[PDB]
């Protein structure tokens, strides 16, 4: 019994276990179950685990990274199916309120972060002067120091990438209305959400369809479950550009 | 950027495209000619492809350079895989770029199997992409090679 | 309202339909194409059904999007 | 009282004479004894008189506002109130944590949707001074403390009893 | 009504030439609801269209009806029934507000964050040509 014949039976057994749809079982349940089985097989203190608690620990809206497929089909192909699993697009992209939450650490410099914002802004925005429903992405960054966070925002404004954060002047309170109009503003390229308290306020001010695309490495943030979520582990910030 | 073009009106089998900036003049010379390929989308994974059928470049006293491109959709590209069919509709406006070499390669390298590929020519507007034909359907369905005198019809005949 | 389309001109065998909102982009892709079936009515009891023959979606600088659907009446639903 | 207010209006301000799109600077003395209410009435009088943002024009202009002598607690509170009453202003800080960008003061001067320009403190005022290229005039209005002005700029100094008489002169 | 018509004519711009119209807000106090409603009935019959945030019978106070009526050219002014509706529409209006008080014996209490003037008059008749 080789690896290729064991591939389709492990996919098929998890399909009717959760009674889910087609492409969830390929990457959202199988790759999640492969890590937690390996996380307890390599554990030298506990190996005998009942499968009753294995079901609930797997069924979370989280897509974790595993080293073994990244070595198998490589970085050109592992990120390729990650684009077609949860980042599917059509020709006509509807003007939805798309929220992009990316993990910023001190190990990743500004330069590997900046073109990811350029990748998100170019692919998920239509600031054409001819359209009537313009849309711009929402950007969230977390896990970084405020000095490094303001350092990134300063250099974005110097190369003509105009954004808003709900702070139109120095000393302003957080007004989410300027975030709302910047979504429909053609001169505002994207929206920069500063904090979590900044984040939780602007869902309540949005009546249109909302979407969250989380791309993180270590720590996840508890986004409310009734929004559509895409939570994806990556190794470093360089992979996030190739998925969006 | 180098080119700033977008679709201003669509038809069942035709798109009107207006070029707004056209900063680099070398894009218009080879990549905006009649019969060339344009990428019509707002993202970089799913797009329409279009043959340029006609264009009209009007200039005047004070108003801007009126560059209009008439294009017809030939199919769909999804993650580097080309699908034939003009049934897909692009809602305007859609950002228009000349197609990169990988899409044009994927036009002819997808509908024909790798063992069925019979290459004897390359595309006129883009030399770097070779055009293979389905050598099965090339010879069963008979070949009618047509040209004027001195056009190269016999040189084409012998090269096949 | 996902769709807002409405007849603006009537011929003996031709209709002019103007789409005003087009909130859902998915309706235009597979339900507003040529050969699709349109329901022309002011109620949900008696209607006219139509074949879409032609369409044109123009966009310009300041004013709104002009989506014009050319259809022909093909029958009556009671 | 009435005859006092008449003299400084005619002598220094000349509201009807000056209609040219110049970068006019209004430096005001904000103190703790003056509430936010009478400050807002002055700012609305400055913006209505010394700006032209009508659609018929081709050379729009907006005044520059600077406040000194007050704490930052009520300076930001006045700024927060002014934004809520749809009096859109810029002060060189388009986002949180930004450095002072004088180019936002350059573009907001010619922007019709931007009613006036705020300046937080002294070194912000000195930095945009080298960023304006066109002719600038400073109209300093003060009660007890006067601010230094560069000697190469057209400057007027007007002394008032308190902040209430100020909107009458403007 | 002569004071209301003078306030309406002087302090509104409902012409079609402008792009930023405005209408005054009217408040009355010290009187009973019997003649307050009778005044409201007489104004509506003389084509002086107003609103008070009560578009239908048995309605909760809707401050956004005074918001649209401020910018509506077909609504000449905005009525306010009493103090509780006055403070409710105060927090709903974001743009600059001024309070103009014309009282003879009893003066209402205005919040100290608004630019307010108080006018003492001998009767109601001389209020008309002050505005
Ligand atoms: N693939 C090609 N690339 C460039 N020139 C070509 C090619 N094939 C033919 N020609 C040119 O076309 C010219 C005409 O020859 P040919 O087409 O054989 O004439 P005819 O079709 O009348 O017999 C030749 O002189 C040759 O240089
Ligand atoms: Mg020959």
mmCIF file of C-alpha atoms in Angstrom, chain D:
data_model
loop_
_atom_site.group_PDB
_atom_site.id
_atom_site.type_symbol
_atom_site.label_atom_id
_atom_site.label_comp_id
_atom_site.label_asym_id
_atom_site.label_seq_id
_atom_site.Cartn_x
_atom_site.Cartn_y
_atom_site.Cartn_z
ATOM 1 C CA UNK D 1 -17.648 99.532 23.087
ATOM 2 C CA UNK D 2 -19.110 99.856 19.592
ATOM 3 C CA UNK D 3 -16.773 102.720 18.653
ATOM 4 C CA UNK D 4 -13.834 100.631 19.874
ATOM 5 C CA UNK D 5 -14.653 97.691 17.575
ATOM 6 C CA UNK D 6 -15.067 99.972 14.546
ATOM 7 C CA UNK D 7 -11.458 101.216 14.562
ATOM 8 C CA UNK D 8 -9.534 97.921 14.354
ATOM 9 C CA UNK D 9 -11.856 96.501 11.683
ATOM 10 C CA UNK D 10 -11.242 99.370 9.255
ATOM 11 C CA UNK D 11 -7.568 100.013 10.040
ATOM 12 C CA UNK D 12 -6.017 96.542 9.750
ATOM 13 C CA UNK D 13 -8.334 93.855 8.365
ATOM 14 C CA UNK D 14 -9.771 95.380 5.137
ATOM 15 C CA UNK D 15 -12.042 92.410 4.485
ATOM 16 C CA UNK D 16 -13.621 93.739 1.280
ATOM 17 C CA UNK D 17 -10.312 94.797 -0.298
ATOM 18 C CA UNK D 18 -8.401 91.496 -0.064
ATOM 19 C CA UNK D 19 -9.978 88.862 -2.321
ATOM 20 C CA UNK D 20 -6.802 87.411 -3.856
ATOM 21 C CA UNK D 21 -5.967 83.723 -3.243
ATOM 22 C CA UNK D 22 -3.125 84.271 -0.774
ATOM 23 C CA UNK D 23 -1.978 81.904 1.971
ATOM 24 C CA UNK D 24 -3.395 83.912 4.859
ATOM 25 C CA UNK D 25 -2.329 82.804 8.345
ATOM 26 C CA UNK D 26 -4.533 83.436 11.389
ATOM 27 C CA UNK D 27 -2.696 83.014 14.698
ATOM 28 C CA UNK D 28 -5.096 83.071 17.640
ATOM 29 C CA UNK D 29 -4.551 83.193 21.401
ATOM 30 C CA UNK D 30 -6.355 80.242 22.990
ATOM 31 C CA UNK D 31 -6.393 80.452 26.795
ATOM 32 C CA UNK D 32 -8.075 78.454 29.545
ATOM 33 C CA UNK D 33 -10.501 81.260 30.451
ATOM 34 C CA UNK D 34 -12.015 81.186 26.937
ATOM 35 C CA UNK D 35 -14.404 78.298 26.342
ATOM 36 C CA UNK D 36 -14.579 76.246 23.151
ATOM 37 C CA UNK D 37 -17.890 77.864 22.090
ATOM 38 C CA UNK D 38 -16.564 81.358 21.337
ATOM 39 C CA UNK D 39 -13.505 79.849 19.647
ATOM 40 C CA UNK D 40 -15.757 77.943 17.227
ATOM 41 C CA UNK D 41 -17.726 81.109 16.426
ATOM 42 C CA UNK D 42 -14.477 82.856 15.477
ATOM 43 C CA UNK D 43 -13.245 79.969 13.302
ATOM 44 C CA UNK D 44 -16.539 79.903 11.394
ATOM 45 C CA UNK D 45 -16.276 83.676 10.907
ATOM 46 C CA UNK D 46 -12.676 83.357 9.681
ATOM 47 C CA UNK D 47 -13.534 80.535 7.271
ATOM 48 C CA UNK D 48 -16.662 82.212 5.881
ATOM 49 C CA UNK D 49 -14.954 85.569 5.277
ATOM 50 C CA UNK D 50 -11.391 84.619 4.280
ATOM 51 C CA UNK D 51 -12.054 81.633 2.015
ATOM 52 C CA UNK D 52 -13.677 81.179 -1.384
ATOM 53 C CA UNK D 53 -14.645 77.624 -2.361
ATOM 54 C CA UNK D 54 -17.495 78.375 -4.777
ATOM 55 C CA UNK D 55 -17.664 76.207 -7.889
ATOM 56 C CA UNK D 56 -17.527 79.225 -10.231
ATOM 57 C CA UNK D 57 -13.959 80.158 -9.263
ATOM 58 C CA UNK D 58 -10.682 78.839 -10.650
ATOM 59 C CA UNK D 59 -8.345 79.998 -7.832
ATOM 60 C CA UNK D 60 -9.739 78.769 -4.500
ATOM 61 C CA UNK D 61 -8.134 79.590 -1.175
ATOM 62 C CA UNK D 62 -8.578 78.660 2.481
ATOM 63 C CA UNK D 63 -7.225 80.290 5.651
ATOM 64 C CA UNK D 64 -4.562 78.849 7.933
ATOM 65 C CA UNK D 65 -5.402 78.541 11.634
ATOM 66 C CA UNK D 66 -2.868 78.396 14.474
ATOM 67 C CA UNK D 67 -3.589 78.315 18.209
ATOM 68 C CA UNK D 68 -1.087 78.829 21.015
ATOM 69 C CA UNK D 69 -1.046 79.265 24.775
ATOM 70 C CA UNK D 70 -3.531 76.443 25.423
ATOM 71 C CA UNK D 71 -3.109 72.836 26.473
ATOM 72 C CA UNK D 72 -3.463 69.934 24.054
ATOM 73 C CA UNK D 73 -6.516 68.625 25.942
ATOM 74 C CA UNK D 74 -8.900 71.309 24.662
ATOM 75 C CA UNK D 75 -6.955 71.896 21.435
ATOM 76 C CA UNK D 76 -7.780 68.369 20.265
ATOM 77 C CA UNK D 77 -11.305 68.688 21.691
ATOM 78 C CA UNK D 78 -11.867 71.831 19.610
ATOM 79 C CA UNK D 79 -10.452 69.955 16.611
ATOM 80 C CA UNK D 80 -12.725 66.988 17.352
ATOM 81 C CA UNK D 81 -15.808 69.216 17.557
ATOM 82 C CA UNK D 82 -14.929 71.111 14.361
ATOM 83 C CA UNK D 83 -14.741 67.880 12.359
ATOM 84 C CA UNK D 84 -18.172 66.730 13.574
ATOM 85 C CA UNK D 85 -19.907 69.883 12.268
ATOM 86 C CA UNK D 86 -18.659 69.137 8.712
ATOM 87 C CA UNK D 87 -15.911 71.789 8.833
ATOM 88 C CA UNK D 88 -13.280 69.623 7.163
ATOM 89 C CA UNK D 89 -9.693 70.680 7.871
ATOM 90 C CA UNK D 90 -6.183 69.288 7.482
ATOM 91 C CA UNK D 91 -3.202 69.741 9.780
ATOM 92 C CA UNK D 92 -0.441 67.739 8.082
ATOM 93 C CA UNK D 93 -1.300 64.518 9.961
ATOM 94 C CA UNK D 94 -3.440 62.384 7.621
ATOM 95 C CA UNK D 95 -3.134 59.241 9.768
ATOM 96 C CA UNK D 96 -2.221 58.172 13.289
ATOM 97 C CA UNK D 97 1.505 58.160 13.997
ATOM 98 C CA UNK D 98 2.288 60.231 10.908
ATOM 99 C CA UNK D 99 5.001 62.861 10.675
ATOM 100 C CA UNK D 100 3.959 66.408 9.791
ATOM 101 C CA UNK D 101 3.363 66.512 6.030
ATOM 102 C CA UNK D 102 3.189 70.105 4.703
ATOM 103 C CA UNK D 103 2.030 68.856 1.281
ATOM 104 C CA UNK D 104 -1.408 68.115 2.761
ATOM 105 C CA UNK D 105 -1.463 71.796 3.740
ATOM 106 C CA UNK D 106 -0.417 72.650 0.170
ATOM 107 C CA UNK D 107 -3.241 70.654 -1.425
ATOM 108 C CA UNK D 108 -5.865 71.570 1.178
ATOM 109 C CA UNK D 109 -5.290 75.262 0.461
ATOM 110 C CA UNK D 110 -6.464 74.759 -3.138
ATOM 111 C CA UNK D 111 -9.036 72.056 -2.297
ATOM 112 C CA UNK D 112 -12.653 73.210 -2.384
ATOM 113 C CA UNK D 113 -13.850 70.424 -0.064
ATOM 114 C CA UNK D 114 -11.301 71.445 2.604
ATOM 115 C CA UNK D 115 -12.563 74.539 4.398
ATOM 116 C CA UNK D 116 -9.401 75.631 6.242
ATOM 117 C CA UNK D 117 -6.042 74.409 7.542
ATOM 118 C CA UNK D 118 -5.076 73.734 11.154
ATOM 119 C CA UNK D 119 -1.596 74.166 12.621
ATOM 120 C CA UNK D 120 -0.923 72.432 15.929
ATOM 121 C CA UNK D 121 2.032 74.414 17.285
ATOM 122 C CA UNK D 122 4.991 76.641 16.465
ATOM 123 C CA UNK D 123 7.400 74.320 14.638
ATOM 124 C CA UNK D 124 4.537 73.039 12.489
ATOM 125 C CA UNK D 125 3.886 76.668 11.499
ATOM 126 C CA UNK D 126 7.561 77.272 10.697
ATOM 127 C CA UNK D 127 7.803 74.119 8.571
ATOM 128 C CA UNK D 128 4.868 74.916 6.269
ATOM 129 C CA UNK D 129 6.223 78.471 5.931
ATOM 130 C CA UNK D 130 9.030 77.101 3.748
ATOM 131 C CA UNK D 131 6.470 74.944 1.897
ATOM 132 C CA UNK D 132 4.141 77.736 0.791
ATOM 133 C CA UNK D 133 5.662 79.368 -2.265
ATOM 134 C CA UNK D 134 2.978 82.042 -2.849
ATOM 135 C CA UNK D 135 2.595 85.268 -0.856
ATOM 136 C CA UNK D 136 1.679 84.748 2.808
ATOM 137 C CA UNK D 137 0.199 87.170 5.337
ATOM 138 C CA UNK D 138 -0.028 86.600 9.093
ATOM 139 C CA UNK D 139 -2.847 88.202 11.088
ATOM 140 C CA UNK D 140 -1.911 87.654 14.729
ATOM 141 C CA UNK D 141 -4.744 88.053 17.235
ATOM 142 C CA UNK D 142 -3.749 87.978 20.891
ATOM 143 C CA UNK D 143 -4.731 89.162 24.367
ATOM 144 C CA UNK D 144 -1.753 88.832 26.721
ATOM 145 C CA UNK D 145 0.929 86.764 24.948
ATOM 146 C CA UNK D 146 2.258 87.502 21.462
ATOM 147 C CA UNK D 147 4.074 85.033 19.222
ATOM 148 C CA UNK D 148 7.297 85.554 17.318
ATOM 149 C CA UNK D 149 6.945 85.873 13.538
ATOM 150 C CA UNK D 150 9.753 85.800 10.926
ATOM 151 C CA UNK D 151 10.708 89.327 9.893
ATOM 152 C CA UNK D 152 10.390 88.567 6.151
ATOM 153 C CA UNK D 153 6.614 87.979 6.329
ATOM 154 C CA UNK D 154 3.808 90.579 6.199
ATOM 155 C CA UNK D 155 2.475 90.564 9.762
ATOM 156 C CA UNK D 156 -0.220 92.480 11.633
ATOM 157 C CA UNK D 157 -0.621 92.438 15.421
ATOM 158 C CA UNK D 158 -4.020 93.204 16.952
ATOM 159 C CA UNK D 159 -4.654 93.504 20.697
ATOM 160 C CA UNK D 160 -8.116 92.742 22.094
ATOM 161 C CA UNK D 161 -9.756 92.717 25.513
ATOM 162 C CA UNK D 162 -10.748 89.049 25.205
ATOM 163 C CA UNK D 163 -11.677 86.458 22.578
ATOM 164 C CA UNK D 164 -15.293 87.638 22.193
ATOM 165 C CA UNK D 165 -14.451 90.789 20.198
ATOM 166 C CA UNK D 166 -12.369 88.846 17.694
ATOM 167 C CA UNK D 167 -15.030 87.644 15.227
ATOM 168 C CA UNK D 168 -16.303 91.229 14.912
ATOM 169 C CA UNK D 169 -12.914 92.397 13.614
ATOM 170 C CA UNK D 170 -12.628 89.473 11.187
#
